[PDB]
Structures are given as C-alpha cells and as structure tokens.
Write an enzyme that holds these catalytic residues in place. Sequence first.
Site, PDB file in Angstrom:
ATOM      1  N   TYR B  33       3.191 -22.980  -4.575  1.00  0.00           N
ATOM      2  CA  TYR B  33       2.701 -21.723  -5.134  1.00  0.00           C
ATOM      3  C   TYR B  33       2.679 -20.631  -4.071  1.00  0.00           C
ATOM      4  CZ  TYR B  33      -0.705 -18.233  -6.660  1.00  0.00           C
ATOM      5  OH  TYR B  33      -1.367 -17.055  -6.922  1.00  0.00           O
ATOM      6  N   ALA B  88      -4.245 -13.899  -3.814  1.00  0.00           N
ATOM      7  CA  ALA B  88      -5.152 -14.692  -4.627  1.00  0.00           C
ATOM      8  C   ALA B  88      -5.357 -16.085  -4.039  1.00  0.00           C
ATOM      9  CB  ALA B  88      -4.573 -14.837  -6.035  1.00  0.00           C
ATOM     10  N   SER B 115      -8.217  -9.644  -3.176  1.00  0.00           N
ATOM     11  CA  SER B 115      -7.616  -9.774  -4.496  1.00  0.00           C
ATOM     12  C   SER B 115      -8.695  -9.918  -5.559  1.00  0.00           C
ATOM     13  CB  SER B 115      -6.733 -11.023  -4.531  1.00  0.00           C
ATOM     14  OG  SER B 115      -6.313 -11.316  -5.851  1.00  0.00           O
ATOM     15  N   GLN B 137      -8.308  -4.919  -4.359  1.00  0.00           N
ATOM     16  CA  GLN B 137      -7.092  -4.881  -5.162  1.00  0.00           C
ATOM     17  C   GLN B 137      -7.414  -5.230  -6.608  1.00  0.00           C
ATOM     18  OE1 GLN B 137      -5.131  -8.138  -6.155  1.00  0.00           O
ATOM     19  NE2 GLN B 137      -4.373  -6.673  -7.677  1.00  0.00           N
ATOM     20  N   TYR B 139      -5.807  -5.132 -10.906  1.00  0.00           N
ATOM     21  CA  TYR B 139      -4.768  -4.940 -11.901  1.00  0.00           C
ATOM     22  C   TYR B 139      -5.327  -4.047 -12.998  1.00  0.00           C
ATOM     23  CZ  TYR B 139      -2.906  -9.134  -9.647  1.00  0.00           C
ATOM     24  OH  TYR B 139      -2.476 -10.062  -8.731  1.00  0.00           O
ATOM     25  N   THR B 165      -2.255  -2.692  -8.091  1.00  0.00           N
ATOM     26  CA  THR B 165      -0.985  -3.405  -8.084  1.00  0.00           C
ATOM     27  C   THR B 165      -0.284  -3.171  -9.410  1.00  0.00           C
ATOM     28  OG1 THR B 165      -1.855  -4.999  -6.538  1.00  0.00           O
ATOM     29  CG2 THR B 165       0.096  -5.667  -7.803  1.00  0.00           C
ATOM     30  N   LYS B 225       0.561  -0.142  -5.396  1.00  0.00           N
ATOM     31  CA  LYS B 225       1.251  -1.228  -4.717  1.00  0.00           C
ATOM     32  C   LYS B 225       2.358  -1.794  -5.600  1.00  0.00           C
ATOM     33  CE  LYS B 225       0.358  -5.682  -2.448  1.00  0.00           C
ATOM     34  NZ  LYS B 225       0.605  -6.741  -3.447  1.00  0.00           N
ATOM     35  N   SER B 247       6.260  -2.520  -1.597  1.00  0.00           N
ATOM     36  CA  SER B 247       6.102  -3.959  -1.711  1.00  0.00           C
ATOM     37  C   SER B 247       6.950  -4.453  -2.865  1.00  0.00           C
ATOM     38  CB  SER B 247       4.632  -4.277  -2.026  1.00  0.00           C
ATOM     39  OG  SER B 247       4.400  -5.666  -2.202  1.00  0.00           O
ATOM     40  N   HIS B 249       5.880  -7.698  -3.626  1.00  0.00           N
ATOM     41  CA  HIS B 249       4.981  -8.796  -3.903  1.00  0.00           C
ATOM     42  C   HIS B 249       5.484 -10.079  -3.246  1.00  0.00           C
ATOM     43  CE1 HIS B 249       1.641  -9.480  -7.003  1.00  0.00           C
ATOM     44  NE2 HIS B 249       1.818 -10.697  -6.523  1.00  0.00           N
ATOM     45  N   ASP B 280       4.878  -3.802   2.919  1.00  0.00           N
ATOM     46  CA  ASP B 280       4.873  -5.254   3.029  1.00  0.00           C
ATOM     47  C   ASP B 280       6.097  -5.863   2.361  1.00  0.00           C
ATOM     48  OD1 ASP B 280       4.454  -6.108   0.347  1.00  0.00           O
ATOM     49  OD2 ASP B 280       2.258  -6.197   0.590  1.00  0.00           O
ATOM     50  N   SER B 281       6.194  -7.180   2.546  1.00  0.00           N
ATOM     51  CA  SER B 281       7.079  -8.144   1.906  1.00  0.00           C
ATOM     52  C   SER B 281       8.145  -8.574   2.899  1.00  0.00           C
ATOM     53  CB  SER B 281       7.670  -7.670   0.575  1.00  0.00           C
ATOM     54  OG  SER B 281       6.662  -7.475  -0.406  1.00  0.00           O
ATOM     55  N   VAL B 283       7.264  -9.352   6.476  1.00  0.00           N
ATOM     56  CA  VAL B 283       6.926  -9.148   7.884  1.00  0.00           C
ATOM     57  C   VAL B 283       6.613 -10.499   8.524  1.00  0.00           C
ATOM     58  CG1 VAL B 283       5.339  -8.038   9.501  1.00  0.00           C
ATOM     59  CG2 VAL B 283       6.106  -6.810   7.451  1.00  0.00           C
ATOM     60  N   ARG B 304       1.961 -14.246   3.771  1.00  0.00           N
ATOM     61  CA  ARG B 304       2.178 -15.685   3.920  1.00  0.00           C
ATOM     62  C   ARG B 304       1.878 -16.221   5.310  1.00  0.00           C
ATOM     63  NH1 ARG B 304       6.620 -14.461   0.134  1.00  0.00           N
ATOM     64  NH2 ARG B 304       6.454 -15.758  -1.739  1.00  0.00           N
TER      65      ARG B 304
HETATM   66  C1  LIG Z   1       0.325 -16.844  -2.729  1.00  0.00           C
HETATM   67  C2  LIG Z   1       0.384 -15.350  -2.901  1.00  0.00           C
HETATM   68  C3  LIG Z   1      -0.579 -14.731  -3.683  1.00  0.00           C
HETATM   69  C4  LIG Z   1      -0.573 -13.351  -3.861  1.00  0.00           C
HETATM   70  N1  LIG Z   1      -1.551 -12.777  -4.650  1.00  0.00           N
HETATM   71  C5  LIG Z   1      -1.540 -11.407  -4.811  1.00  0.00           C
HETATM   72  C6  LIG Z   1      -2.537 -10.793  -5.562  1.00  0.00           C
HETATM   73  O1  LIG Z   1      -3.455 -11.443  -6.082  1.00  0.00           O
HETATM   74  N2  LIG Z   1      -2.514  -9.424  -5.697  1.00  0.00           N
HETATM   75  C7  LIG Z   1      -1.512  -8.666  -5.125  1.00  0.00           C
HETATM   76  O2  LIG Z   1      -1.509  -7.442  -5.242  1.00  0.00           O
HETATM   77  N3  LIG Z   1      -0.527  -9.271  -4.400  1.00  0.00           N
HETATM   78  C8  LIG Z   1      -0.550 -10.629  -4.221  1.00  0.00           C
HETATM   79  N4  LIG Z   1       0.437 -11.204  -3.457  1.00  0.00           N
HETATM   80  C9  LIG Z   1       1.460 -10.324  -2.802  1.00  0.00           C
HETATM   81  C10 LIG Z   1       0.946  -9.926  -1.412  1.00  0.00           C
HETATM   82  O3  LIG Z   1      -0.044  -8.918  -1.520  1.00  0.00           O
HETATM   83  C11 LIG Z   1       2.046  -9.370  -0.516  1.00  0.00           C
HETATM   84  O4  LIG Z   1       2.707  -8.319  -1.199  1.00  0.00           O
HETATM   85  C12 LIG Z   1       3.038 -10.446  -0.075  1.00  0.00           C
HETATM   86  O5  LIG Z   1       2.330 -11.597   0.363  1.00  0.00           O
HETATM   87  C13 LIG Z   1       3.937  -9.916   1.049  1.00  0.00           C
HETATM   88  O6  LIG Z   1       5.027 -10.789   1.289  1.00  0.00           O
HETATM   89  P1  LIG Z   1       5.023 -11.820   2.530  1.00  0.00           P
HETATM   90  O7  LIG Z   1       3.698 -12.533   2.502  1.00  0.00           O
HETATM   91  O8  LIG Z   1       6.207 -12.723   2.275  1.00  0.00           O
HETATM   92  O9  LIG Z   1       5.256 -11.007   3.787  1.00  0.00           O
HETATM   93  C14 LIG Z   1       0.415 -12.575  -3.257  1.00  0.00           C
HETATM   94  C15 LIG Z   1       1.380 -13.191  -2.471  1.00  0.00           C
HETATM   95  C16 LIG Z   1       1.369 -14.571  -2.296  1.00  0.00           C
HETATM   96  C17 LIG Z   1       2.439 -15.191  -1.443  1.00  0.00           C
END
Ligand SMILES: Cc1cc2nc3c(=O)[nH]c(=O)nc-3n(C[C@H](O)[C@H](O)[C@H](O)COP(=O)(O)O)c2cc1C
Lengths: 358, 358, 358, 358
Positions: B33, B88, B115, B137, B139, B165, B225, B247, B249, B280-281, B283, B304
């Site tokens: 996940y 989350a 989150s 954050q 929704y 988001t 976001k 982002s 996500h 992000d996404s 880094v 991550r």
């Molecule tokens: C397991 C997981 C859960 C996430 N949960 C949320 C969330 O609840 N709300 C949200 O806005 N983004 C969520 N994200 C997106 C992150 O905010 C972020 O955009 C993302 O982790 C960035 O990519 P990277 O971790 O690969 O660098 C989640 C990402 C992951 C990997």
Amino acid sequence: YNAPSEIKYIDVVNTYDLEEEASKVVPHGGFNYIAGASGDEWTKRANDRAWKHKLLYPRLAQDVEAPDTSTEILGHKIKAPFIMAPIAAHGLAHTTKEAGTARAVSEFGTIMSISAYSGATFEEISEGLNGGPRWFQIYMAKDDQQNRDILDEAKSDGATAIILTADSTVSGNRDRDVKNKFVYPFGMPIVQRYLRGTNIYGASKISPRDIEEIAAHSGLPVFVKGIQHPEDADMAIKAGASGIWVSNHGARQLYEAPGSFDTLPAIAERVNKRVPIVFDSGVRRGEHVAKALASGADVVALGRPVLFGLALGGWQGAYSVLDYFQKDLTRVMQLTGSQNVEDLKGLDLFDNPYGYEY
Amino acid sequence: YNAPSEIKYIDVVNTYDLEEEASKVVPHGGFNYIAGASGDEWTKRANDRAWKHKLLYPRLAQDVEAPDTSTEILGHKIKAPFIMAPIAAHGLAHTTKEAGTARAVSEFGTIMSISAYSGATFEEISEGLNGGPRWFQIYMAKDDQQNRDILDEAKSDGATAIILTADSTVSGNRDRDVKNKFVYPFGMPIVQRYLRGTNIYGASKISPRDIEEIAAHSGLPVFVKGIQHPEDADMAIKAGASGIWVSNHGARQLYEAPGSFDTLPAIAERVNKRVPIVFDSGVRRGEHVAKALASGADVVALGRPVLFGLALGGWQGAYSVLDYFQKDLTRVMQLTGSQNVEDLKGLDLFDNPYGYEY
Amino acid sequence: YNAPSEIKYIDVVNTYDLEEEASKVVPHGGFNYIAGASGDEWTKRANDRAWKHKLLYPRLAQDVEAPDTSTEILGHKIKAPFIMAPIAAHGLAHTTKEAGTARAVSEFGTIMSISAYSGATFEEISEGLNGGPRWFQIYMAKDDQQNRDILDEAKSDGATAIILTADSTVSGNRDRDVKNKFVYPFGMPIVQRYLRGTNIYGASKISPRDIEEIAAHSGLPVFVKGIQHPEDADMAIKAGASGIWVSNHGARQLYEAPGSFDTLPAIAERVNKRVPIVFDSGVRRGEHVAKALASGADVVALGRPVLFGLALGGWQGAYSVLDYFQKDLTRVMQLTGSQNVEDLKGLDLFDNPYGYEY
Amino acid sequence: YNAPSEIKYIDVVNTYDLEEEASKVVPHGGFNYIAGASGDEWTKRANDRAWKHKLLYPRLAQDVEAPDTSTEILGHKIKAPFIMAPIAAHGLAHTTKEAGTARAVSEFGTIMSISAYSGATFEEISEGLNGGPRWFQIYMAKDDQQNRDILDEAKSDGATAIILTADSTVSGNRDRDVKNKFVYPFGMPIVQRYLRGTNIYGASKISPRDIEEIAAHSGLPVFVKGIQHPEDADMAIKAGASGIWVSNHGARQLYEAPGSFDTLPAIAERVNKRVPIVFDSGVRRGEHVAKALASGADVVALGRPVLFGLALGGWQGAYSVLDYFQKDLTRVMQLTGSQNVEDLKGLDLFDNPYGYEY
Ligand SMILES: Cc1cc2nc3c(=O)[nH]c(=O)nc-3n(C[C@H](O)[C@H](O)[C@H](O)COP(=O)(O)O)c2cc1C
Ligand SMILES: Cc1cc2nc3c(=O)[nH]c(=O)nc-3n(C[C@H](O)[C@H](O)[C@H](O)COP(=O)(O)O)c2cc1C
Ligand SMILES: Cc1cc2nc3c(=O)[nH]c(=O)nc-3n(C[C@H](O)[C@H](O)[C@H](O)COP(=O)(O)O)c2cc1C
Ligand SMILES: Cc1cc2nc3c(=O)[nH]c(=O)nc-3n(C[C@H](O)[C@H](O)[C@H](O)COP(=O)(O)O)c2cc1C
C-alpha cells in the site's frame, strides 16, 4: 593493505576490461575507492555515454604523410595529446604507487600530474619521473600559509604548472566508500610535510578571488580544474587562470550532473582560444581523445584506465595503457583522414539526438 | 496487523535502499500500500527519472560563509526547505504511527502535514508534535457540514494552513492493492469524530468554486494540492488559494501522466510569485530538493522515504531520513557554489534531451 | 482444436495480464496466431509505447454531474466510446466463438464488427447479438461478383456500416505463425457461402477507385480501415468513404511502421471533422481511450484484450473486459475533470519527447 | 579449417536468426571474424537500430499491376534492387567459398562483387558466375604497379565496374579477432598472382587524387566505397567517381560512428542524381531495402546474411537468402502501395525521434 606488486606489460584490447581485471588483484576497499562514483553512479555512466552523442565520420585523406600524434602544451612537446590526471593514493593500486605511474608517464613521453594527496614522497616520485615534466595539483587551503607552503613545494619540485582543483570543497556522496567503510591505509607525506604541528580534508576551502590569489603568487600557469559551466570558465580566466581543465572529477563529486563531454563545447566556445583547455572525465578510447580535440580541448587527461593498468602490471602495465591510447588514436586518425593532432581539432562530428540506445 | 515497533536511528546512505529494507519489516499488504502506485507504476518511475532531465552544474562560489539550509514559509522558519507531506495511516509502517512521524518532524524543525485520514487521534499526534507547526490536509466533502466540521477541527488543532487535496476524487488504479486485496486494519479517528451517525471515501467530492468556498471559510491559507497543469494553478489562485502544491500524489492517482518534476517549471512561470509553491512526488535526494528550488518551488514535501524510515526506526528512523536530506542538501550547496536556499533558487540547470538512458 | 469452453466472469485488474492468462488455456498455435505480430513485433511494441508519448494531466472539474461514458456514432447510442474490432476466427479463443463475443458486445451496449472471415455463421452470430448493432468488415475481391455478394450479405445481416479493410492485400510477416506452421482448424462459412464452386485469401485485391466502387454500391456508410497516412485519409474521403478507421491491424501487417497512436493527430487534422474516425491498434487502458478521443478519434475499437477475455470466460469473460474499460475510463474522467465523452475530446495532453524510458 | 560443405536450400523466416544458426556450423574463429565488428559493436548495433529512425507507412495503391522488383544499374537489368557486397574469404563460411556465393548471385539474377582478398581464384569464381555480371573491389596500393596490375585483372575478368574501398587504410579495432587471435587459414590467390616476388595488408594506402588516378586508368566506372560524409561524396564525384557506395564496412572499421542508414539522406541530397548510389551496412529485411530506396539509394548491397546462408547451405543456402529478400520486398511493396522499384523511391517516411526504445 596488500596491493599488487607485479611489474609486467599487458595486452590492452580495450580499457573497459581493465576494470574487472584490476578488481581481481586490488583489495576490495581500495578497488571500490578507485572505481566508484557518487550516488548510484548515473553521472559516471553519463560520462561514458556522452561519447555517443557526437559521432565520428570516416573521411578521405588530404595528405600523404603517416599520422603523427605529437602535440605541444605550455611549451612541452608530448608524444600524444593526453596527460596523466592528478589522482591520489596510487598505492591503493600498486606497491610502486605514484613512482610507478610517473615512470610510465615519463618513459611514454607526456606530463605527470601530481596530486597533493600523493601517498609517495616527491623524492619517490622524482625517481620515477627521471626528469620528465610534471604539474602539481593543489586544493585551496583555508589557512593561507598552507597555500604559500604548497606553492613553494611545487616550485621546488620543478612543477611547470599548478592545477587548482575547485570541485572538491567537500567529498561527493560516494556510496561504495560509505558502505565499505573505506579508510586510507597510508599517509599523505607531501601535505604532512607542511601540516605537521599546525583534519587534512577539512583544511581545504573556491571563488574567483581564490583563483586570483593563487595565480598571483604561484609563479606558474594555473589551470582551474572542475569547470563544467561556461560562465565559470570566463570568470576563472578574468581572475588570472592560464588554463581551463574541464572535469567532473570522474563523477566522484557532484551527482546528477551532466556527462563531462556534453559540457565541453559550450566551455570551448566561451574560452575562445584565450587559454589552453584540458578535458577529462570518461576518456576510455582513442575515439574519445579525437572527439575531445574536435570539440575544443587541447589535450585530455587520463585517469582510471592508467591506475587499473598500474594495478595489473606496475609501471609497465600503466605504460601499456598509454601505448594503447596512442595506437588507438593513430587508427582513428587514419580512418578520419587526419595526419596530425591539428587535423583532429578540425573534425566535423555527427550529432546523434537518439543518445545511447540509438 | 504486526507493524514494527523498534525505535532507533539508522545510517541513511541513500533513501532508495530504505524501500527494500522496510519491505523486510512491514507486513506485505501494508508495505505494498505504501510503496505501490497506479497501473504498472510507469508514472512513479517517471517521477524518479524526471530528475535526470535537468542536471546540476558544479560551480564556483561567490560567498565565504558556510552553507545555511534554513528558509521561511508562511512565517514559519524551518531548518531546511522541505516539509512532511500528508500521508494517511502511518500505523501501516510503525506502531507509533503519526505521533512518531510528528516527533521526528518537530524535533528536526520543519512542518508536519496531518492527513484527515490519520490513524492517530490528534491528541496522539499533538504529543509527538510538542508544539511544532502543523498544516491540516482535507478532502472536499459532498456534505458541506462535514467541510465546516473539519475546518473547525483544523483550527482547534492549531493548524496554520489547510491543504486541499484535489486529485483524489476517486482512487487511482493501484494494482498492488487490488491484487493483495488490501484492507485498512484500523480506523480514521479524526474523520470518524465527525462522520459518526451521519462510505468515508465516498463522502468526498474539486472545482474552482470548491476552492473558493474552502478559502472563504477556513480562516487559514489554503494550498491546493495535486496541481500539474498551469491553467489550474491560475484558476486556483483566482479562486482564493494562498498556495499551489504541485503533486501527482506520489503517482498513486492518475496513470500515464507526466513525472511531477517535469510539470513544475510551467506551473511556476504561471504562478509567477503570486503564492508559495510546494513541490512533491519523487523527492529522494538533496539534488532533487535543489532542482525543485531552482525550478520555482519554495519548499518540497517528503513522503515515502520518511515513512520507510519510520518503519525501520520509529521517530528516530524518520528523523534520520530528515537529517540525511539536510546533510545531502548541504553537500549539493557546497558543490553548486550556493551559500543559502535563495542561492539554490538561482541555479542554472543543464537540459538533458536524452533522458534517463543518456 | 481444443479451445476453452468455460463461461464465467473474470476479475480484470488490467488487460495486459490477460495475455499470459489466455496462453495457459488456448492451444499454442491458435494463441500465437492471436497474440503475435509481424517481424520481431517491434511495431506491436510501438503501438503500446506510443501511449507514453502524450500524457494526461489531472485537472480540476468544471461540472457537478457524475461522469457519463455514453456517446453516439452513425446514429447508434453506445454505452462507452469503444466498439469491437473485426477479428477473424474467434473459435481459436473459445468454443462459443463469434456468438460469444457478440453476446458480450450486445449485452454491454456497443457495436459488434463482424469479420468476413468469421468462423461462425451469421445465424450463430445473430443469436448472440440478439438485435444489437453490427457492422460488417470486408476485403476487396478481385472478382467483382464476390463484392456484390458480400455487400448483399451485409445488408441481409442488418449491417449499418461496411468496414473496408485496405491494409491486408497480403499477409504480414508473422514470424510466430510461420515458425508454428499454423493452419486454421475450421472454415469460413460466410465467405464459403459465396465462393463455393467459383484461394480464399488469394481472392482479395485497394485504390481510391476501389473505395469509390464499394461506397457507391453498398447502400451503407463505408469506413476505410488501415489508414496511417493523412493523404490516404483525404483521398479516401474524396472517393466516398463515410469514415476513417485509423489502424495498423494490431501490427499484424506492415513491419517497421509507426505505432498507430502516433499517426492519429496528423490524420485527424486532415480529416478535420469531415467523417467520423475510429481508432485502433494497441488500446489496453481507459487512459488510451481518453488519449485517442483527445487526439481526434470519435471511438476506439478493441481487439486482443476482448479475445483474451473470451478465451478465459466466454461471453462473460469478454463482457468483463468491456466492463473493465468502461470503469477504467470513468476513473480517468474523474481525474481529468471530465464529465462526459465530449470533455475528453477537449483534453490538453503533455508532450513527452523522452519516450518510453523517460 | 573445417568449414561446412553441405549444399541445401533453407527456409528463411528472417535473416537475424541465420547468425546464431551459422555459429553452430562455422569454426569459432572464422565465425567471429564474419560476425564481429569494431569496439564493443555499438556501431554495428547502430547500423541495425537506424532503420527504426524512419518508419514506413502502409498506403493505398494507385496502380492495378502486380509488383515488379526488377531494376537497372549501369546498364545491368537485375531481378531485385540489391547486389552482393564485396566480402573477403568466403571459405571461412563454406568450402565452396566465393564460387558458391557467385552461383547463388548469378542464378538469382543480380551482380556479384568480387573482393580482391577472395580466397578463390577467379577461375573458380568464374565457374560459379557462369557469365553473370561482376564488379571488382580493390584497395589502393602504395606501389602503383600493383594498381595497374589489379585494374588489368579486373578487365581480364570481365568486370563492368571497379569498387574502390576507401575506408580500410588500416583495420578496425575488431575485439573478437584480437581476443580469438584469429588468423586467415588460407591465401589470397588474386593478390598473390601479382604480389609474388615484389605485407599484403600493409601494401594498401585514399585521397581525391587517388580516386582521380583510379578513375582515369580503370576503363570502367569507379564506385568509391565507405562514404559517410556528404563533402566526401562531392569530392569523390569531382575527382571522377562514377558512383558513391555509402557504407561503414558493416561496422568493421571506424568505431563510435553513426549507423550507416542515418548518413544516407545527407549524402543523397548532395549527390543529387549525379551518379548512382549503392547503400550498405545493416540491411536485414525487405523494409530496409525499401527505406534505402526511399532515402536516395539506387540499390543496396547485402553482406553478412548471404554469408550466413552460404555457411548453412552453400550456394542453395545463399540463394535462399536472396530469394527471401526478394519475397520480403514484394510484401513491403504491396503494403506500401508500390508497384515497382521506382515507386519505392517515392515513399514518404515517418520520422521517429524516439529511436529504438520508442
Ligand atoms: C501511503 C501514502 C499515503 C498517502 N496519503 C495521502 C493523503 O492521505 N492525503 C494526501 O493529500 N496525500 C497522500 N499521499 C500523497 C503524499 O502527500 C505525497 O504527495 C506523496 O507521498 C509524494 O510522493 P513520494 O512520497 O513518492 O515522494 C499519500 C502517499 C502515500 C505514498
Ligand atoms: C581514485 C581517484 C582519485 C582521484 N584523486 C584526485 C585528486 O587527488 N585530485 C584531483 O584533482 N582529482 C582527483 N581525481 C580526479 C581525476 O583527476 C580525474 O578528473 C578523473 O580520474 C577523470 O575521470 P576518469 O578517470 O573516469 O576518466 C581522482 C580520481 C580518482 C578516480
Ligand atoms: C487474431 C486477429 C485477427 C484479426 N482479424 C481481422 C480481420 O479479419 N479483419 C480486419 O479488418 N482486422 C482484423 N484484425 C485487426 C483488428 O481489427 C484490429 O485492428 C486489431 O486487433 C487492433 O489491435 P489490438 O487488438 O492489438 O488493439 C485482427 C486482429 C487480430 C489480433
Ligand atoms: C567478413 C566480412 C568481410 C568483408 N570483406 C570486405 C572486403 O574484402 N572488401 C570490402 O570492400 N568490404 C568488405 N566487407 C564489407 C562489406 O562489403 C559490406 O560493406 C558489409 O558486409 C555490409 O554490412 P552488413 O553485411 O552487416 O550488412 C566485409 C564485411 C564482412 C562482414
């Protein structure tokens, strides 16, 4: 530290195979110190793949003479348009260390670059050089007395140029060395001669003002090494540099940067003949020497392949690598229609927008 | 669900290796996940490979001071130009869950993003934060009372910004989760506090009108976001957004979309300083932080790698990842000639048209 | 020939996995007839990789309604913007053959394309269709009486369009079939009804004059299928075509040709709304449906994934694939801010000059 | 040297598979002499991958006649637009050596090119040719009497053109041959007839003046072979060449050069119909023949695939390869809408900027 000690010539078919061969005789930690690069080595791979971005044309000849690889730089006539790059701690590769490399370089007939972080004393290196030309590589010390000290050392050692390495303010993120927990097994006698009683890596600081200071006090032409951006080349020349040494330190410093050869044309265009250009970082074939010349370098510097040759055969093994490059370049000259090094500077290269996978 | 519980610092050589390491201690379903992405993960790979499209130059320094990674965003002085992304269900990675991440983030000295789908109560998170800054954050709910509820929650929780988001109207096609038949093993206490008696995922709806409503009623600056297109950035600002959070996500939403970093310059050019940009996404390195800054981001958000650090060592493991990024960035600053975060915003990047294979 | 016969719904996570799954239940020769392509399949791979050349943006919504995938083509309202491509010999995949595919297509609510080389009689297909719309695909016969015959067949069979396949004058160089020495295990009853007493593959001839003849005598709109070059599209329309069907036959014909999606924009720009465009060759995901629409197609046609679904579950397995595409497209609509199929036609795509490796 | 001796037709599905098949019957050293190339073979791979840079379109026909592959060059009507390239030492592939290749080429109905380094005497080759057309390939000797000798030989042997190979002043860096320590197991009777009593490889010297000398004294049209740069083509024509033979010698000479097909358009544009163009280096499929024609070649020359066919089946195996190319080209003609070789010269190619990985 059980470095190889055998002295023998080696049959060099290509320099890439020397890496794996040397890995069988050099202790693991030292070998990975020599071979490794920053991050996941993507920029080391970029240094290698950059050569496929500009391709050589076979072409008709316009002269009847046999090819001649000789050239001249800063008044030194050299047998081929390549010199030895400054590399620390040759004792990691072979017990004869920098004296072995110096003997190969002098006997071949080009210029030896001496790292301030040599594991050999200058007297040891001098025996190998047997009068051959040498340049001295330094880092900028924070303690200005240490800069005065090392410039005096270089002059006393007969150096005819200073190589001011700018790209090593701190170490690259060299994952192999961190994971191996590598530690230098021997000392640095040249720097210790001056540092005793006054942390070695942490003694080093460069800016244009630093270049100006070194150029004003060295009494010798100063190359600034590590340049990859044209504006730095212009600033370095305006600060008093007598040469530009295009390099990314064999990808051992900044990660996720371009392959060094890709940066050369923009630098050469900005330098615009004002000072000589040395190019390094990834030269493995005669075709690479030719491409660098065609792209604005006056000579290239060789690094890892010579050290791998030293590991495999001492000074004779290092000599075999230099001989390989000279013969490889001669073939490239024949097939590009080039009679001499100046002809290579005039080659037209094919632009390959597809990159390595074509 | 048998999440790791050990608390220890970890020696971070690079953040990529943390993924495989965490896979050995995190239950299979929860690990996939965290790690997985939409489709065959091509866009997650694109997020990573995009960093090779723009390359850093090593360059001379113009200032004598040691590097300083601090910066300021929305009045918060932070130790380095990165914040924690909202993620989350941290309990999938470690028993200390969001409280552990919050402790690492607060002790390091940056901003925690909470989150709405946290597995920890705010009181649990608050203990870890120990007064540190936090953003909340959310929704967009279809039931507008739930939006009023969560905005009140954020204010009561001391949030100093809202992260709206927009890119999660429905879930991405996350093949790993479908094939693993993954199910959240615990609840969402913050949303349940408000939803009880009034399907959680299905409660969420965004348009410019939604942005306007949230911005008008939150009493706090609102980041939107999930932005990847410049016209959305312009529309969001005109609707009242106080920040743009570029982002995709972590590639967990729309498949066969660009790598996030490739979208940043066009967005930054359109935003044109009007509001701060969080990027992000993907880094993973200090070089990525620097490149994002040079391309128009004010800070980046980490995701991550921090969660993998939490899995491996709880708050101390997550702290180790933040410390790694700060030290990695410092090295990049030294080698790019940058003394401070503003200098990084001024870097010239090398355009690599060959992409990843060079 | 021991084709599968089981009828069941299947849980489609993605359509790529259906290929390997079908290979476990379909006889080797027939499976490789379905799956294979010309040469070393580089152009089949190009059909797939072309989708990474234009990338989707997630974007904000401008409408409050739930997404609706329905559309209309040639007066037929269909549940989603995809139809069934004409494919010969469905009995290679499943004992229920074209009747099974027709039942899935009719029950789902789109258009069935009937290959002239069907292994099922029309009466068998008609039972599956249960009144659903159907188009009839033909090849141009050298014997013009056979063209009159098949056009009469199509009209008697209730066809509402003719698909004139132009790209099959001779077979592609399908290495799998040559190496397997594959031979059709059953007959072609529709063509045999007319050829008896009057070599089947060798009966087929196309030029603009052929298109004009078919369009003048069919009494139905004629799509010309196999177009990849814009000038052919213009010539076909001027000759009387009522539709352009952009296709490379699933890469089963000309080798070392472009991926089909890469040819679509230039064709759509030249067609310039004059007639509807059907696009096929490589559609595997909802994102591909969306990209084709955004690039000028009115609908796409599905091929191999539906046949693999038929192999795995008969009409219910084929239905599961159609259902997958409809649900996958709905997700893409949500995340691109699209409420309906027309919105998808208006999407802005990100140009990825790096291609597949990014 | 135990070369194969069996004579049989072979079922050619594609020419790539002939390489591995021939490796099972040809002695290791000789096989790697035939198959190998310079360096790490990157430029041999470039010759192959270049074909994916320009892609064929399937297109409608404008003529009713069956396709005809015949063409004419220098007054010779040939059955298809390909000839046999000059290749030394066919005895490495088969005991019937050049006589076997000549029989295949003559029986098929095209032109045989005879290498000066043939292992067969001309009388042996003449028996295989049975009156068929032949061109004679020479290298420029330093001893001008040897040039007069070989030109007399060519005339006495009924040659109707001279092929002056320019790209072989010295050998390429053929790593396979160096590592295998390969040595020719037999002699070169044609050159020995003239060299006896007067080192063979070292006898060879080309410049525009050399081209002028050969063209003035041969009494036959002279092709200059090995051209990859347009200015060389212009200079060669001005010096008296009657043809340009675009080639990189199958990548056996200069390393880190372009794929040969990528050089063809610029040469054809400069030649601008002045003399015929022969293209070689990497032709493996009928699609390649078509692309070369569309890009300005009048014919292509075939090399390695024919030798591999000879290894596998003697003259009948070599014939099978020629037959394959003729049938493969016919299919490509059908699917591109081409009735004859002139139509192929008029094809519009799709430019693929993504290269091989797409
Ligand atoms: C397991 C997981 C859960 C996430 N949960 C949320 C969330 O609840 N709300 C949200 O806005 N983004 C969520 N994200 C997106 C992150 O905010 C972020 O955009 C993302 O982790 C960035 O990519 P990277 O971790 O690969 O660098 C989640 C990402 C992951 C990997
Ligand atoms: C093991 C090793 C040690 C080096 N030590 C130094 C040094 O002390 N001073 C310096 O200026 N460069 C040093 N360099 C960089 C080299 O001067 C040169 O830029 C590099 O070797 C060129 O890359 P290449 O060997 O991959 O072609 C070193 C490089 C290596 C591989
Ligand atoms: C096994 C098979 C049989 C086919 N038979 C026909 C046919 O009889 N008539 C026709 O016009 N196209 C035929 N096609 C081409 C399809 O109509 C369609 O263009 C192709 O399946 C699209 O590629 P895709 O399935 O890879 O997405 C066939 C394709 C396959 C794979
Ligand atoms: C084993 C071998 C021997 C060759 N000998 C000669 C030769 O004697 N003279 C010459 O002009 N070219 C020679 N060539 C080059 C060929 O004429 C031709 O350019 C090359 O085979 C084309 O590349 P391909 O076979 O990969 O398509 C030789 C090539 C090979 C592979």
